[PDB]
Amino acid sequence: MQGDAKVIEYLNAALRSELTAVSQYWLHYRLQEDWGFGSIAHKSRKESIEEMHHADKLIQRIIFLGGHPNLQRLNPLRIGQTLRETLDADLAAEHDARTLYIEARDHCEKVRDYPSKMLFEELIADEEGHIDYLETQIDLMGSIGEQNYGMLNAKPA
Amino acid sequence: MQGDAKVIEYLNAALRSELTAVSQYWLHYRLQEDWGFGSIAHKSRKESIEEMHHADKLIQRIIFLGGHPNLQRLNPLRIGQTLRETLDADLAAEHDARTLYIEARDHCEKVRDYPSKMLFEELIADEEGHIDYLETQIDLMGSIGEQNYGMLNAKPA
Amino acid sequence: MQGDAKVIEYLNAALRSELTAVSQYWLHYRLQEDWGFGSIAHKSRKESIEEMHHADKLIQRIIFLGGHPNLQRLNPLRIGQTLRETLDADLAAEHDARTLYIEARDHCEKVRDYPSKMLFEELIADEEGHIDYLETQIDLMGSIGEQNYGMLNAKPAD
Amino acid sequence: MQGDAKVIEYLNAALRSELTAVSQYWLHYRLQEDWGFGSIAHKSRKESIEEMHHADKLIQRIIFLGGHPNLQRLNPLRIGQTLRETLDADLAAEHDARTLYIEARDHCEKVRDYPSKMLFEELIADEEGHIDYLETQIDLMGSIGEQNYGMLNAKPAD
Amino acid sequence: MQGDAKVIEYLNAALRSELTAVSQYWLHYRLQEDWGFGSIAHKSRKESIEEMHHADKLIQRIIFLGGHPNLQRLNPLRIGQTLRETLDADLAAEHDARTLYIEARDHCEKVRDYPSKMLFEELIADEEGHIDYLETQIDLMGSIGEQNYGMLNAKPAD
Amino acid sequence: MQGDAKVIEYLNAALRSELTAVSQYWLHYRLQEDWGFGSIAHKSRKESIEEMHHADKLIQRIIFLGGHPNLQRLNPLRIGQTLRETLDADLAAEHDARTLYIEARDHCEKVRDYPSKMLFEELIADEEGHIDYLETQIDLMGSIGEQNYGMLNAKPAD
Amino acid sequence: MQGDAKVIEYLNAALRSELTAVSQYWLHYRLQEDWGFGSIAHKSRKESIEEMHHADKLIQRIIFLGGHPNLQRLNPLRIGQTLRETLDADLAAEHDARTLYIEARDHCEKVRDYPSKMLFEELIADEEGHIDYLETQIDLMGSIGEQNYGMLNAKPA
Ligand code: HEM
Ligand code: HEM
Ligand code: HEM
Ligand SMILES: [Fe+3]
Ligand SMILES: [Fe+3]
Ligand SMILES: [Fe+3]
Ligand SMILES: [Fe+3]
Ligand SMILES: [Fe+3]
Ligand SMILES: [Fe+3]
Ligand SMILES: [Fe+3]
């Protein structure tokens, strides 16, 4: 069924966002494990699959509203060089992503597209959940220090 | 059955004490886990539920003696800002709490209310048990140091 | 995640509201048992634990918004002595809570803090189903007598 | 091991008041049951059995102490003539023994017979459990009418 | 159902002699055990419990008959001072009650109270089982020396 | 938890008392087996391990009171050579212990150190049940002969 | 059966040695766990029970040779104040103990009491096993350092 011409645009921008978040944590998963931190790299992995199901949902919904999901392009990817940079790249991502999901959110009701609104309500809560978790790591880290952090976050033969 | 007008007062003061200890470790459970120390925050949690069953018992006993359990007010809550302050706030609490349970204890026999006395005997042993455990943490801590302590006490993705 | 300073005072209020509720539900639990009404007593035990999870959910979130929770105080408790007074009493508490919850949800909707909004909206349903329930006991009290209602909810001497 | 002369008879008045308890309780069981009130009849029965166990512990302790248990005569029993009277009559038997037990509990403190001392401190808590129970059964009875309580404690096809 | 006045007291002397039995037996259990003779102490205990059951049946029957059980006082008990004396003293308690039971068993025949009649004809066979038992334990004792019998009935690490 | 310096010397004494007991019980274990009395031997093995837990419970607590335990020494051991001398011997040790335990509990009651008090009170029951037991073997020795008692507790050549 | 009057003396001296080793590691088990190092305190415990079965064997054997096991006295107990002192007190013990079991060993054959010799062969191998393990700890320790050591060796709520 024909859907708000703008809700779709918003849903595409969103999709460009998760798809970015996907390649970015996936790429982080593989850097952290190769650095010796396979336990945060196990998380970085599940966070990527989580974003995977996010885009899946978004594409589902667009096609519903008779739109065309632009998968073709990503936004600018951030890649840390150090554990801490990895947790910032994610934090700064989840923040941008957020600001957007609300502004898109605040639009779906105006056009009275409510299920598409509570798919932003879902995402917002997810992201914020993800924000919660990132913050704690960076508190944890800059409390016990960046090496213990890594030890705590690695594994031995 | 009508009970010593004072044993009741004592039992209420006690109740005001556990109920304080409940909100204080519960609140600590949620601060420590958000700081990255979910493993001491798992203990802080069970210690709170332990105090939960304590108040439950106290209320049971008052109502027995035909008294009126004042749940309405708590004492002054202590909240650490740092792992160590968290383990002191608890220690100083368990100490006060103790001094009291004995003085109340020493009163139940005089008025010859013995089961109410051996409910202070229970609590005293509990608290002291809890004192035992706190002390060890603060020895452990100020031996291997405050960061290892936290690492030992946290968890990774 | 630096939260809106006004959102936090609303959640802090809901906290003091729920903590209050924990206590007043838990007291009626213990009075009812001792009076005899095993059953309704067992139900108030559980509705207290209900709140126990809500008080917690509030602390969780407040802390995440960078706020500082306040368990240091609670509101005026309504403790009945008859059985109907227990039900009247709980009702009034729920109504109060819901009036607060509806208001806090609107503040959040207006700061565009949506997850707090969905907490208060999931909070409202909670209290409202509670309400539905209580209004049924009192509904049933009117019908079968303020006395057969006690026996229904009384456990036998097992 | 030779006990304090007086401890070895506090034990024997506890034995006395326990055997009467046993008889009394068991009579009510058999009464409350012929009357129609099976459930409370059954509680009445469990409680006889718990005194059976007290009696035993007392007999045991005495013999360890080199004293001679006196199961010969038992106190005057109170037998109810209605359901309401049964609980009453059982509440006084209890109030007595609890009073007895304390007075003995501290004789033991004085002669330094701390395990006897503990026995009694334990026996108190069990007679207290029973009182809290009988009281509460009176509150309930009192409030849901002494006629419905009657029926809450019956059976039909059992 | 209103019983024959006399049947409703034969039942009550059987009740009497049964409760004494119970006490007596149980005392020997606790004695025979502090002495070292655990096994016979344990038989002594099972048998207390079987009288517990007789007492009950008697109490039941009386109440059906509209009579008032009299658990108030019990017969003079015979307490042994040696293992040999315990069995002796238990053998007379038995010879008595068996004698009592028959005399009552045919009162019942005469008033036509055939189920009471049967009760007693049953109680006989159970006191007979016990006699045959105590006798036989005397034969044995008598023959393998009253010192070995002692030990055949003991335990070591139990 | 800075403990009363006098409480600690009492627990230190109980420690030396129990450590002593461990050893003397464990020696009778090994002598009895070698003499033949498998059973009573197996029992002394276990009563030694009993103490093993008490010696431990003392160390635990002392350390918690901020004290310094002393395992460096023990008291004069009583080692019998006959089987009755083993039983006599253990008795005397228990009596000694209990006299110490009763005294230490009173010191604690008076410093208002209640958990140490409840340790010594739970310690007294321990030794007293032990006593009960030993006085039964010797009780049974008097009865069946100082010789059949050995055979009872002897294991056969399996 | 009557046994070498000296093998017995040696076996008693030995017994005085294990019994010393028993109270010493048991006492160490309880100090280390109260300091926050319950995982080395779990070992210190099993090492004590191991020595328990050692004395048990020794007493068995003496009584066999128609001797009288002197349980009455212990040697001078060592008690560390710090994890490291705990691992030295044990090391110095196991060393003394050793020197002795050989000298006793070297005597059982001369008097041609061979099973009593291969009970010293057992003990020697045990002790040396125990020596092996202590050494490794003190290498491990004075390599990663005394705090990591303790962290590695403790546990959290
Ligand atoms: C009068 C005060 C309270 C009493 C008497 C009480 C009592 C209890 C009891 C008895 C249980 C578990 C039953 C069992 O398994 O044995 C329980 C569970 C629980 N309590 Fe409370 N409680 C009190 C207040 C609180 C507070 C202030 C909180 C925190 C806001 C809280 C949070 C919880 C939670 C979350 C559980 C379930 C376990 C879980 O899901 O984590 N309670 N309580
Ligand atoms: C002399 C004092 C008495 C003592 C020490 C005593 C002891 C006991 C004990 C120990 C049990 C079961 C405990 C177990 O299973 O370990 C029991 C059950 C029973 N009691 Fe007694 N009793 C006494 C007197 C009585 C009396 C007066 C009655 C009333 C008729 C009675 C009737 C029964 C019956 C019928 C049972 C079997 C119930 C069952 O366990 O299924 N007893 N008693
Ligand atoms: C002659 C001296 C001792 C001997 C021969 C001895 C022997 C034994 C043996 C053989 C076992 C376990 C049986 C098995 O499962 O294989 C044991 C267990 C035990 N031992 Fe001893 N022991 C002695 C002294 C001590 C001391 C001084 C303590 C500490 C105070 C102690 C504390 C324990 C404890 C607590 C257990 C049971 C496990 C536990 O609950 O932690 N023992 N002993
Ligand atoms: Fe997302
Ligand atoms: Fe507590
Ligand atoms: Fe709620
Ligand atoms: Fe009782
Ligand atoms: Fe019979
Ligand atoms: Fe002991
Ligand atoms: Fe060794």
Side-chain angles (χ1 to χ4, degrees):
Chain A
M1 198 30 67
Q2 182 65 348
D4 180 73
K6 205 149 196 168
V7 151
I8 294 173
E9 87 143 55
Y10 263 112
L11 285 176
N12 259 299
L15 173 56
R16 190 160 37 192
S17 211
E18 297 297 288
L19 273 165
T20 292
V22 171
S23 286
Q24 177 191 286
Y25 317 150
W26 190 266
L27 169 62
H28 278 153
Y29 140 51
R30 282 298 194 194
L31 275 173
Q32 288 152 181
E33 77 159 26
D34 187 82
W35 293 342
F37 308 116
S39 89
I40 189 177
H42 165 53
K43 192 72 194 173
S44 308
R45 193 177 152 285
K46 289 187 312 164
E47 292 314 273
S48 192
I49 297 188
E50 182 185 46
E51 312 278 322
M52 277 202 252
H53 298 284
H54 278 192
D56 184 87
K57 262 86 133 52
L58 287 183
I59 291 152
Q60 188 207 293
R61 183 80 191 159
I62 290 148
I63 280 158
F64 173 41
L65 322 181
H68 183 90
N70 175 311
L71 286 91
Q72 172 79 72
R73 245 77 271 301
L74 316 198
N75 291 12
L77 235 23
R78 303 182 184 78
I79 302 139
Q81 273 150 335
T82 77
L83 249 160
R84 307 80 58 170
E85 289 189 72
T86 226
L87 306 162
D88 286 316
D90 290 40
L91 188 49
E94 227 57 41
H95 258 301
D96 286 333
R98 180 166 169 276
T99 221
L100 171 63
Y101 296 160
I102 80 156
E103 189 182 303
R105 179 283 178 178
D106 274 8
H107 181 101
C108 293
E109 38 32 279
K110 254 83 227 176
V111 322
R112 284 151 87 67
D113 181 11
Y114 304 119
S116 285
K117 174 213 83 176
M118 329 210 93
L119 168 94
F120 287 124
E121 304 270 65
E122 252 248 310
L123 302 184
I124 294 187
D126 249 57
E127 314 306 288
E128 275 201 28
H130 206 191
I131 297 169
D132 199 346
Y133 156 84
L134 281 175
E135 300 188 300
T136 298
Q137 292 307 129
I138 295 181
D139 293 3
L140 178 38
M141 174 182 272
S143 180
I144 75 180
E146 320 193 333
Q147 319 184 67
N148 286 236
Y149 194 84
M151 206 200 75
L152 178 69
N153 276 305
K155 334 151 106 160
Chain B
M1 198 30 67
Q2 182 65 348
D4 180 73
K6 205 149 196 168
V7 151
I8 294 173
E9 87 143 55
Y10 263 112
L11 285 176
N12 259 299
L15 173 56
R16 190 160 37 192
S17 211
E18 297 297 288
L19 273 165
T20 292
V22 171
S23 286
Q24 177 191 286
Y25 317 150
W26 190 266
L27 169 62
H28 278 153
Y29 140 51
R30 282 298 194 194
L31 275 173
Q32 288 152 181
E33 77 159 26
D34 187 82
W35 293 342
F37 308 116
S39 89
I40 189 177
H42 165 53
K43 192 72 194 173
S44 308
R45 193 177 152 285
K46 289 187 312 164
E47 292 314 273
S48 192
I49 297 188
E50 182 185 46
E51 312 278 322
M52 277 202 252
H53 298 284
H54 278 192
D56 184 87
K57 262 86 133 52
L58 287 183
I59 291 152
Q60 188 207 293
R61 183 80 191 159
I62 290 148
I63 280 158
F64 173 41
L65 322 181
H68 183 90
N70 175 311
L71 286 91
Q72 172 79 72
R73 245 77 271 301
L74 316 198
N75 291 12
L77 235 23
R78 303 182 184 78
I79 302 139
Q81 273 150 335
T82 77
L83 249 160
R84 307 80 58 170
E85 289 189 72
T86 226
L87 306 162
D88 286 316
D90 290 40
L91 188 49
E94 227 57 41
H95 258 301
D96 286 333
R98 180 166 169 276
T99 221
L100 171 63
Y101 296 160
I102 80 156
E103 189 182 303
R105 179 283 178 178
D106 274 8
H107 181 101
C108 293
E109 38 32 279
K110 254 83 227 176
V111 322
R112 284 151 87 67
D113 181 11
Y114 304 119
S116 285
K117 174 213 83 176
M118 329 210 93
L119 168 94
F120 287 124
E121 304 270 65
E122 252 248 310
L123 302 184
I124 294 187
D126 249 57
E127 314 306 288
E128 275 201 28
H130 206 191
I131 297 169
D132 199 346
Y133 156 84
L134 281 175
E135 300 188 300
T136 298
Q137 292 307 129
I138 295 181
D139 293 3
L140 178 38
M141 174 182 272
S143 180
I144 75 180
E146 320 193 333
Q147 319 184 67
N148 286 236
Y149 194 84
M151 206 200 75
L152 178 69
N153 276 305
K155 334 151 106 160
Chain C
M1 161 162 259
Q2 174 42 56
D4 175 359
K6 221 77 191 62
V7 159
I8 278 152
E9 27 214 50
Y10 260 119
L11 302 152
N12 249 311
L15 176 60
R16 167 150 67 263
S17 170
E18 299 282 304
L19 283 164
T20 285
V22 207
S23 283
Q24 175 192 293
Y25 273 96
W26 195 271
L27 196 38
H28 287 150
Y29 154 50
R30 281 285 149 198
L31 285 158
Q32 290 174 159
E33 188 206 277
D34 179 71
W35 297 334
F37 317 106
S39 286
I40 165 70
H42 263 79
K43 172 79 168 183
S44 326
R45 198 185 150 278
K46 286 186 307 190
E47 290 306 292
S48 183
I49 303 195
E50 198 184 55
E51 251 66 353
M52 286 198 201
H53 291 277
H54 304 187
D56 182 66
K57 279 200 144 64
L58 291 160
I59 292 157
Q60 191 177 172
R61 169 99 176 160
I62 293 165
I63 283 190
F64 163 67
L65 300 179
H68 169 71
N70 170 280
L71 301 89
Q72 175 61 34
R73 321 200 166 272
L74 58 79
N75 295 326
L77 294 183
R78 312 172 176 76
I79 311 160
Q81 306 130 323
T82 71
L83 222 194
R84 326 69 84 151
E85 266 173 37
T86 280
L87 301 165
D88 296 313
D90 276 315
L91 202 29
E94 297 292 335
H95 278 303
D96 289 25
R98 174 178 176 286
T99 269
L100 164 77
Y101 291 164
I102 153 189
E103 198 183 295
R105 110 94 199 183
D106 285 332
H107 183 91
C108 304
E109 159 93 331
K110 263 72 191 198
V111 297
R112 293 160 73 157
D113 176 17
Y114 300 113
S116 302
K117 189 198 103 301
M118 288 184 324
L119 185 60
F120 289 118
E121 280 185 348
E122 283 278 92
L123 231 170
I124 309 190
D126 251 275
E127 314 311 276
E128 271 192 13
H130 213 137
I131 301 188
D132 178 33
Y133 157 80
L134 301 172
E135 293 166 310
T136 294
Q137 311 308 144
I138 304 176
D139 208 349
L140 173 58
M141 270 189 69
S143 295
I144 53 162
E146 334 249 79
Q147 181 174 298
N148 307 266
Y149 186 78
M151 128 165 282
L152 190 50
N153 287 292
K155 273 169 171 199
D158 299 275
Chain D
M1 182 209 266
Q2 178 50 23
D4 176 66
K6 288 303 145 272
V7 170
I8 301 170
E9 54 173 57
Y10 267 135
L11 286 171
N12 258 309
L15 186 44
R16 228 179 53 196
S17 78
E18 271 301 342
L19 290 147
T20 79
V22 178
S23 289
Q24 183 169 297
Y25 295 35
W26 193 279
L27 182 59
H28 283 161
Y29 152 46
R30 278 284 177 207
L31 281 168
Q32 291 163 174
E33 137 148 8
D34 187 68
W35 286 345
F37 309 109
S39 48
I40 202 169
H42 189 25
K43 173 64 151 202
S44 206
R45 165 183 187 274
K46 296 193 215 275
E47 296 302 300
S48 207
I49 295 174
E50 281 168 29
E51 307 278 34
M52 285 228 191
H53 285 287
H54 287 166
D56 193 25
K57 285 201 140 70
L58 283 158
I59 295 191
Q60 167 254 310
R61 184 76 191 144
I62 294 168
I63 285 177
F64 164 61
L65 296 177
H68 185 77
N70 195 318
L71 302 95
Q72 182 65 40
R73 311 282 159 200
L74 55 93
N75 296 149
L77 305 185
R78 302 176 185 74
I79 302 146
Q81 239 177 53
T82 68
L83 204 175
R84 157 77 187 272
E85 267 167 68
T86 256
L87 298 180
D88 283 323
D90 277 332
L91 187 50
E94 286 297 0
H95 267 314
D96 294 318
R98 176 199 168 271
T99 303
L100 166 73
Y101 294 172
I102 112 175
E103 199 248 18
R105 169 282 184 201
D106 45 331
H107 178 63
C108 296
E109 175 87 334
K110 286 30 177 208
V111 297
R112 264 100 146 65
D113 186 17
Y114 306 115
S116 299
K117 161 185 170 297
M118 294 322 293
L119 182 45
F120 288 93
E121 288 202 62
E122 290 287 291
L123 277 189
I124 312 199
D126 296 23
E127 306 275 50
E128 299 250 314
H130 203 200
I131 285 151
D132 177 34
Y133 172 82
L134 297 156
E135 298 203 317
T136 301
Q137 214 65 22
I138 296 283
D139 287 317
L140 182 44
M141 197 203 304
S143 46
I144 63 154
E146 284 149 358
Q147 183 123 298
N148 292 259
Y149 178 89
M151 189 232 78
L152 177 56
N153 292 285
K155 298 178 179 171
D158 323 273
Chain E
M1 182 209 266
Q2 178 50 23
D4 176 66
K6 288 303 145 272
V7 170
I8 301 170
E9 54 173 57
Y10 267 135
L11 286 171
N12 258 309
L15 186 44
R16 228 179 53 196
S17 78
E18 271 301 342
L19 290 147
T20 79
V22 178
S23 289
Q24 183 169 297
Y25 295 35
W26 193 279
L27 182 59
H28 283 161
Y29 152 46
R30 278 284 177 207
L31 281 168
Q32 291 163 174
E33 137 148 8
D34 187 68
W35 286 345
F37 309 109
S39 48
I40 202 169
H42 189 25
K43 173 64 151 202
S44 206
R45 165 183 187 274
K46 296 193 215 275
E47 296 302 300
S48 207
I49 295 174
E50 281 168 29
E51 307 278 34
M52 285 228 191
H53 285 287
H54 287 166
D56 193 25
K57 285 201 140 70
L58 283 158
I59 295 191
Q60 167 254 310
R61 184 76 191 144
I62 294 168
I63 285 177
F64 164 61
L65 296 177
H68 185 77
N70 195 318
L71 302 95
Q72 182 65 40
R73 311 282 159 200
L74 55 93
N75 296 149
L77 305 185
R78 302 176 185 74
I79 302 146
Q81 239 177 53
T82 68
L83 204 175
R84 157 77 187 272
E85 267 167 68
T86 256
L87 298 180
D88 283 323
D90 277 332
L91 187 50
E94 286 297 0
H95 267 314
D96 294 318
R98 176 199 168 271
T99 303
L100 166 73
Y101 294 172
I102 112 175
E103 199 248 18
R105 169 282 184 201
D106 45 331
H107 178 63
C108 296
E109 175 87 334
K110 286 30 177 208
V111 297
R112 264 100 146 65
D113 186 17
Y114 306 115
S116 299
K117 161 185 170 297
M118 294 322 293
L119 182 45
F120 288 93
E121 288 202 62
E122 290 287 291
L123 277 189
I124 312 199
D126 296 23
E127 306 275 50
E128 299 250 314
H130 203 200
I131 285 151
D132 177 34
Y133 172 82
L134 297 156
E135 298 203 317
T136 301
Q137 214 65 22
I138 296 283
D139 287 317
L140 182 44
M141 197 203 304
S143 46
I144 63 154
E146 284 149 358
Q147 183 123 298
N148 292 259
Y149 178 89
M151 189 232 78
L152 177 56
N153 292 285
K155 298 178 179 171
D158 323 273
Chain F
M1 161 162 259
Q2 174 42 56
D4 175 359
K6 221 77 191 62
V7 159
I8 278 152
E9 27 214 50
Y10 260 119
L11 302 152
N12 249 311
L15 176 60
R16 167 150 67 263
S17 170
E18 299 282 304
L19 283 164
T20 285
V22 207
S23 283
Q24 175 192 293
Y25 273 96
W26 195 271
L27 196 38
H28 287 150
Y29 154 50
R30 281 285 149 198
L31 285 158
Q32 290 174 159
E33 188 206 277
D34 179 71
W35 297 334
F37 317 106
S39 286
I40 165 70
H42 263 79
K43 172 79 168 183
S44 326
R45 198 185 150 278
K46 286 186 307 190
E47 290 306 292
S48 183
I49 303 195
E50 198 184 55
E51 251 66 353
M52 286 198 201
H53 291 277
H54 304 187
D56 182 66
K57 279 200 144 64
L58 291 160
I59 292 157
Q60 191 177 172
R61 169 99 176 160
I62 293 165
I63 283 190
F64 163 67
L65 300 179
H68 169 71
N70 170 280
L71 301 89
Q72 175 61 34
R73 321 200 166 272
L74 58 79
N75 295 326
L77 294 183
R78 312 172 176 76
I79 311 160
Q81 306 130 323
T82 71
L83 222 194
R84 326 69 84 151
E85 266 173 37
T86 280
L87 301 165
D88 296 313
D90 276 315
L91 202 29
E94 297 292 335
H95 278 303
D96 289 25
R98 174 178 176 286
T99 269
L100 164 77
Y101 291 164
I102 153 189
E103 198 183 295
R105 110 94 199 183
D106 285 332
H107 183 91
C108 304
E109 159 93 331
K110 263 72 191 198
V111 297
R112 293 160 73 157
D113 176 17
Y114 300 113
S116 302
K117 189 198 103 301
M118 288 184 324
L119 185 60
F120 289 118
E121 280 185 348
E122 283 278 92
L123 231 170
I124 309 190
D126 251 275
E127 314 311 276
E128 271 192 13
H130 213 137
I131 301 188
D132 178 33
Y133 157 80
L134 301 172
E135 293 166 310
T136 294
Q137 311 308 144
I138 304 176
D139 208 349
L140 173 58
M141 270 189 69
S143 295
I144 53 162
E146 334 249 79
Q147 181 174 298
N148 307 266
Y149 186 78
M151 128 165 282
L152 190 50
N153 287 292
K155 273 169 171 199
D158 299 275
Chain G
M1 198 30 67
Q2 182 65 348
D4 180 73
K6 205 149 196 168
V7 151
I8 294 173
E9 87 143 55
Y10 263 112
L11 285 176
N12 259 299
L15 173 56
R16 190 160 37 192
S17 211
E18 297 297 288
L19 273 165
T20 292
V22 171
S23 286
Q24 177 191 286
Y25 317 150
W26 190 266
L27 169 62
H28 278 153
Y29 140 51
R30 282 298 194 194
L31 275 173
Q32 288 152 181
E33 77 159 26
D34 187 82
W35 293 342
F37 308 116
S39 89
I40 189 177
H42 165 53
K43 192 72 194 173
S44 308
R45 193 177 152 285
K46 289 187 312 164
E47 292 314 273
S48 192
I49 297 188
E50 182 185 46
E51 312 278 322
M52 277 202 252
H53 298 284
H54 278 192
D56 184 87
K57 262 86 133 52
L58 287 183
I59 291 152
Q60 188 207 293
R61 183 80 191 159
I62 290 148
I63 280 158
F64 173 41
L65 322 181
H68 183 90
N70 175 311
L71 286 91
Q72 172 79 72
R73 245 77 271 301
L74 316 198
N75 291 12
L77 235 23
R78 303 182 184 78
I79 302 139
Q81 273 150 335
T82 77
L83 249 160
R84 307 80 58 170
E85 289 189 72
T86 226
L87 306 162
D88 286 316
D90 290 40
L91 188 49
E94 227 57 41
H95 258 301
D96 286 333
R98 180 166 169 276
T99 221
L100 171 63
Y101 296 160
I102 80 156
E103 189 182 303
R105 179 283 178 178
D106 274 8
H107 181 101
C108 293
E109 38 32 279
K110 254 83 227 176
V111 322
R112 284 151 87 67
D113 181 11
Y114 304 119
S116 285
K117 174 213 83 176
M118 329 210 93
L119 168 94
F120 287 124
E121 304 270 65
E122 252 248 310
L123 302 184
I124 294 187
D126 249 57
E127 314 306 288
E128 275 201 28
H130 206 191
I131 297 169
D132 199 346
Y133 156 84
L134 281 175
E135 300 188 300
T136 298
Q137 292 307 129
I138 295 181
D139 293 3
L140 178 38
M141 174 182 272
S143 180
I144 75 180
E146 320 193 333
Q147 319 184 67
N148 286 236
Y149 194 84
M151 206 200 75
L152 178 69
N153 276 305
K155 334 151 106 160

